[PDB]
Write a structure and sequence with these properties.
Layout (H helix, E strand, L loop, with lengths): L31 E4 L2 H8 L8 E5 L2 E3 L11 H4 L6 H8 L1 H4 L7 H17 E3 L4 E5 L5 E3 L2 E4 L2 E6 L2 E3 L7 E3 L7 E3 L5 E4 L2 E6 L2 E3 L10 E2 L2 E2 L7 E4 L3 E6 L2 E7 L2 E2 L14 E4 L2 E7 L3 E2 L4 E4 L2 E3 L13 E3 L6 E3 L2 E3 L9 E3 L7 E3 L2 E2 L2 E2 L2 H4 L19 H11 L7
Family: Belongs to the polysaccharide lyase 1 family.
Function: Produces unsaturated products from polygalacturonate.
Organism: Bacillus subtilis (strain 168)
Length: 399
């Protein structure tokens, strides 16, 4: 079968569980679309009622920050009439506003501005859908795909720069506050049976090194790359290339969302993370199989310095095998970050800078995560992971 008609293999990760992930492979001809702009993409996707098997080939670059005539939209197009960055900055400056939550005119105007952009960039993917890049240059720029449905395949697309023109200041986010933005490349919001494969995720032409600092904190226009939340379940992410980005993959959005327990069953394999700061993945609750991934970066990088690879969040059950981490000077312990409620991690075959390490033991974590993955393909020796992943991961490697 061609790219549009291929399904996730019956052994290939958590996405293969129960009914598996077949996307729109059973599509009739009348439900096979080629799209090359926002209008064509939105028309092909339709509404949540569009559950018939469908295949959508993306041809070329689809810029999601465009109006209905495909004219590019920017800050002043989306801006609420009452919003002004200078005044927003003046209103909420810690030196005069303190650490209370931004409220009043400018914050309300910013929130409205954000909803204006959201209307353009954020799109829901309906059930039984395969979206695949045609050739080696299929791109989604500025877009935030959301999957709340069942049975979706996304492959061979370079997702670039899910950019929020209106980051929100939160003075209570960390010891010196932070700016936060809303858009991921892909958000799995309660979605199930999903395969994300041979995609690339990056910050395009607007990396975080091009954003100024306000209040001494980076004016952060980006959110996640591939996030999973709200009971998202049975997902395989394979052969993806994540690069040049801060927060990559957050699985389970809140310590309070205890309904995520028993869900967030995700398999990550053969992914490349280059110059990714953190959360690759950060996990709460989920049985997450992480195998044969390659991580490369620098703690002293000026654009995207490595912080950690695996986030051991509340009640997380990461099962890691034969992953390779290349970050000069990094200790075995610092390959991961342990958050309150995180007590367990299984990792075997972990290679840090060419040396075999035990990340779990280095962090005093239990190795008992209470499960072992039964749905997986062949496991590469750690020794071949770097080569295999660099050669095979990302968009434009199939076509
Ligand atoms: Ca935050
Ligand atoms: Ca976020
Ligand atoms: Ca997110």
């Amino acid at each position: 079968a061609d790219l549009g008609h291929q399904t996730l293999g019956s052994n290939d990760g958590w996405g293969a569980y129960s009914t598996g992930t077949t996307g729109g492979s059973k599509a009739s001809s009348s439900n096979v679309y080629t799209v090359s702009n926002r209008n064509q993409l939105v028309s092909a996707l339709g509404k949540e009622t569009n559950t018939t098997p469908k295949i959508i080939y993306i041809k070329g670059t689809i810029d999601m920050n465009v109006d209905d005539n495909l004219k590019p939209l920017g800050l002043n197009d989306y801006k609420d009439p009452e919003y002004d960055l200078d005044k927003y900055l003046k209103a909420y400056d810690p030196s005069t506003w303190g650490k209370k939550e931004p409220s009043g005119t400018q914050e309300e105007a910013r929130a409205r501005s954000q909803k204006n952009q959201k209307a353009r960039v954020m799109v829901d993917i309906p059930a039984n859908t395969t979206i695949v890049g045609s050739g080696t240059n299929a791109k989604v720029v500025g877009g935030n795909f959301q999957i709340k449905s069942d049975n979706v395949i996304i492959r061979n697309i370079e997702f670039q720069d899910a950019y929020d023109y209106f980051p929100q200041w939160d003075p209570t986010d960390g010891s010196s506050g932070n700016w936060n933005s809303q858009y991921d490349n892909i958000t799995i919001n309660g979605g199930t049976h999903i395969w994300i494969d041979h995609c690339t995720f990056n910050d395009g032409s607007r990396p975080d090194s091009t954003s100024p600092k306000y209040y001494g904190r980076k004016y952060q226009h980006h959110d996640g790359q591939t996030d999973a939340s709200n009971g998202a379940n049975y997902i395989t992410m394979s052969y993806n290339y994540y690069h040049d980005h801060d927060k990559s993959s957050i699985f389970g959005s809140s310590d309070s969302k205890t309904s995520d327990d028993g869900k967030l069953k995700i398999t990550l394999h053969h992914n490349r993370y280059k110059n990714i700061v953190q959360a690759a993945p950060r996990v709460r609750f989920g049985q997450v199989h992480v195998y044969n991934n390659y991580y490369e970066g620098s703690t002293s990088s000026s654009s995207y310095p490595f912080s950690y690879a695996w986030g051991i969040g509340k009640s997380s059950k990461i099962y890691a095998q034969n992953n390779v981490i290349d970050v000069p000077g990094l200790s075995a312990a610092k390959t991961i970050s342990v958050f309150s409620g995180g007590t367990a991690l299984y990792d075997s075959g972990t290679l840090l800078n060419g040396t075999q390490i035990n990340a779990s033991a280095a962090n005093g974590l239990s190795s008992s995560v209470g499960w072992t993955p039964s749905l997986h393909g062949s496991i590469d020796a750690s020794a071949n992971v770097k080569s295999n992943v660099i050669n095979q991961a990302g968009a434009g490697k199939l076509n």
